Scaffold this active site. Structure first.
Site, PDB file in Angstrom:
ATOM      1  N   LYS A  52       0.781  -1.243   0.000  1.00 45.28           N
ATOM      2  CA  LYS A  52       0.000   0.000   0.000  1.00 45.28           C
ATOM      3  C   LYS A  52       0.807   1.285   0.000  1.00 45.28           C
ATOM      4  CE  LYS A  52      -4.398  -1.167   1.907  1.00 45.28           C
ATOM      5  NZ  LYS A  52      -4.420  -2.629   1.951  1.00 45.28           N
ATOM      6  N   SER A 301       0.462 -10.050  -0.947  1.00 46.68           N
ATOM      7  CA  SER A 301       0.139  -8.646  -0.778  1.00 46.68           C
ATOM      8  C   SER A 301       0.635  -8.038   0.530  1.00 46.68           C
ATOM      9  CB  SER A 301      -1.364  -8.439  -0.934  1.00 46.68           C
ATOM     10  OG  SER A 301      -2.069  -9.354  -0.152  1.00 46.68           O
TER      11      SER A 301
HETATM   12  C1  LIG Z   1      -5.974  -3.995   1.394  1.00 46.98           C
HETATM   13  C2  LIG Z   1      -5.191  -5.232   1.194  1.00 46.98           C
HETATM   14  C3  LIG Z   1      -5.467  -6.078   0.028  1.00 46.98           C
HETATM   15  C4  LIG Z   1      -6.539  -5.679  -0.963  1.00 46.98           C
HETATM   16  O1  LIG Z   1      -6.347  -4.373  -1.533  1.00 46.98           O
HETATM   17  P1  LIG Z   1      -7.497  -3.661  -2.436  1.00 46.98           P
HETATM   18  O2  LIG Z   1      -6.811  -2.637  -3.281  1.00 46.98           O
HETATM   19  O3  LIG Z   1      -8.400  -3.133  -1.354  1.00 46.98           O
HETATM   20  O4  LIG Z   1      -8.167  -4.807  -3.178  1.00 46.98           O
HETATM   21  C5  LIG Z   1      -4.750  -7.259  -0.120  1.00 46.98           C
HETATM   22  N1  LIG Z   1      -3.798  -7.642   0.744  1.00 46.98           N
HETATM   23  C6  LIG Z   1      -3.445  -6.936   1.840  1.00 46.98           C
HETATM   24  C7  LIG Z   1      -2.379  -7.417   2.781  1.00 46.98           C
HETATM   25  C8  LIG Z   1      -4.135  -5.668   2.138  1.00 46.98           C
HETATM   26  O5  LIG Z   1      -3.781  -4.956   3.236  1.00 46.98           O
END
Ligand SMILES: *Cc1c(COP(=O)(O)O)cnc(C)c1O
Ligand SMILES: *Cc1c(COP(=O)(O)O)cnc(C)c1O
Ligand SMILES: [Mg+2]
Ligand SMILES: [Mg+2]
Lengths: 318, 329
Positions: A52, A301
């Site tokens: 993010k 992610s």
């Molecule tokens: C928020 C998040 C996602 C999903 O992100 P979006 O853009 O909301 O689909 C996936 N994995 C992790 C670890 C997150 O914090």
């Protein structure tokens, strides 16, 4: 669409001094299970423990001198909070972070985020802070700048593994998958993008099947990062550029998390393991996407998870 | 010494097709705690979950076709067992792995995973050795040492060849120590490349024989050990001791709660699923003993050898499977 290859390349240029080019990992043992070559893009190793910071950095550094001088603000209970705090620290401006929240708080203090506590109430507190300070709101999913930052994941991945033919992406608000799909489709239109979503928060799958943004009265998943609904800038990407949503239950998510720890040696959070669960699933294995695939990118992610249970037992052991 | 820069370079070329060139990771958060720049050499990401495949691959691939025709043999309840099984699998030869009957189910599974021919033994070292001897007598298989041999030490030194290329500015290296194979290889290669590099051992308080040996000026053993660092319970061998004596500046001894603290930091900050033995280098870097030492004042850029990631997290998974059910309830 809300972003494009141009805005994504502008993002990459803009955030390159501030985010890591994260590694791609693989495992012959996992490859054998799936019957395909898997490439794990490890955003768990990104600054602040998730992808993010890319979108948050792009949003913040894209602001002009006048705007950014009022600071930034967001309300979040999850990874977005820490990402905004760090991005603002790197820019040299205050970040007003309205919480909530679980650990995820410690990550904000680590980056000098100014925490403003919430109990509805989140929006009211975030609203008051905005009205008084003029601080700019930074969106976790649903904006051009965060979508654009998120797509840099695809620019790196396809430089690192140029023959990738399909990418599996966890989905919540759809910012990550929107950026990933937009960048990837522009570099190679034949790449297939697939979403990975939990059974108890399966709005994106329902949405695609129904041709319209579905919301749910509640959600029921341990994948704490995956409980949001699609936004009006992300849904169009999900609708047009994502082939399918692979839905898996939480047990499969835990099974996949276990494999990440034990086989890859990567301490992921449940939300970051779901792409692997999707790749291991019968739903995927028995499908055409599977038959047509050869080299599959998996977006891991993040890695922010409270393992206090583990540590307590170890300290008890002595 | 039993190995040298030339042996280690021969090892590099021999094992390059078969092992991973592992990554270096860092963290600004951990750096601020230590007051130095740390560089984590991630052997947890090596094949079979640890560095030992280097030494084991070197030993096995150095053999000629007739030597290897009767297979290889070792005894181990740990990471070495799986490393030898994998190396043997890579060459396509039999591996007789003598394991104590009470060995962790996880470490046995890692051997089965690579097709190791398991030969069971009682728990004492004398039992394991008696069985290892009988296997050698029945098969002629060649013994692969986990610690104490030229080929094992030379393979382990490739860790340093990589690390010093990856982070040329490294001026000190902290290395977990048990039998001393890893630290001997690392030290011999690092000192040959740069004789002013400082090499430090990290050792558990409940298995501090290397520290005791350095103070005594010869190999000292203990009547028992008592550490959660399950890969760090061995004693030095007659080929590793000379290197520890001459080329390792100091042995940093930390307790098991420091090891747990450092493991926690590896998981939570680095996001690396280490085993307790693999975290001890960070515990050493974080200790008062190190921070007040002359080595700390002299140091700037510190390599930490994260030696492995093979750990049984059964307790974590059981709690997670429980939690998801309640959550749906
Ligand atoms: C928020 C998040 C996602 C999903 O992100 P979006 O853009 O909301 O689909 C996936 N994995 C992790 C670890 C997150 O914090
Ligand atoms: C064996 C082992 C060590 C110690 O290696 P020696 O060559 O015996 O000193 C350290 N860490 C891990 C994870 C191990 O398996
Ligand atoms: Mg959903
Ligand atoms: Mg010892």
């Amino acid at each position: 669409y809300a972003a494009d290859i141009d805005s994504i390349r502008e993002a990459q240029a803009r955030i390159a001094p501030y985010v890591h080019r994260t590694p791609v990992m693989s495992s012959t043992s996992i490859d054998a299970m799936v019957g395909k070559k898997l490439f794990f893009k490890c955003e768990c190793f990104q600054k602040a423990g998730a992808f993010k910071i890319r979108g948050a950095s792009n949003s913040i550094f894209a602001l002009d001198d006048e705007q950014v001088s009022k600071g930034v603000v967001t309300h979040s209970s999850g990874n977005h909070a820490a990402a905004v705090a760090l991005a603002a620290k790197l820019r040299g401006i205050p970040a007003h972070i309205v919480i909530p929240a679980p650990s995820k708080v410690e990550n904000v203090k680590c980056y000098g985020g100014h925490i403003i506590w919430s109990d509805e109430s989140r929006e009211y507190v975030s609203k008051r802070v905005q009205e008084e300070t003029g601080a700019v709101l930074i969106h976790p999913i649903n904006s051009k700048y965060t979508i654009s930052g998120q797509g840099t994941v695809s620019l790196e991945l396809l430089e690192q593994v140029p023959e990738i033919d399909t990418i599996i992406v966890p989905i919540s608000g759809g910012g990550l998958i929107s950026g990933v799909a937009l960048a990837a489709k522009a570099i190679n239109p034949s790449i297939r993008i697939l979403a990975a979503e939990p059974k108890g928060a399966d709005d994106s799958a329902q949405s695609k099947a129904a041709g319209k943004i579905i919301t749910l009265p509640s959600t029921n998943t341990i994948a704490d990062g995956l409980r949001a609904f699609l936004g009006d800038l992300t849904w169009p990407v999900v609708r047009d550029l994502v082939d399918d949503v692979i839905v898996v239950d939480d047990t499969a998510i835990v099974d996949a998390m276990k494999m990440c720890y034990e086989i890859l040696k990567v301490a992921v959070e449940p939300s970051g393991a779901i792409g692997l669960a999707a790749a291991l699933s019968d739903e995927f294995k028995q499908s055409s996407a599977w038959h047509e695939s050869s080299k599959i990118g998996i977006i891991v992610s993040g890695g922010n998870v409270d393992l206090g249970t583990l540590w307590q037992s170890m300290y008890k052991h002595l």
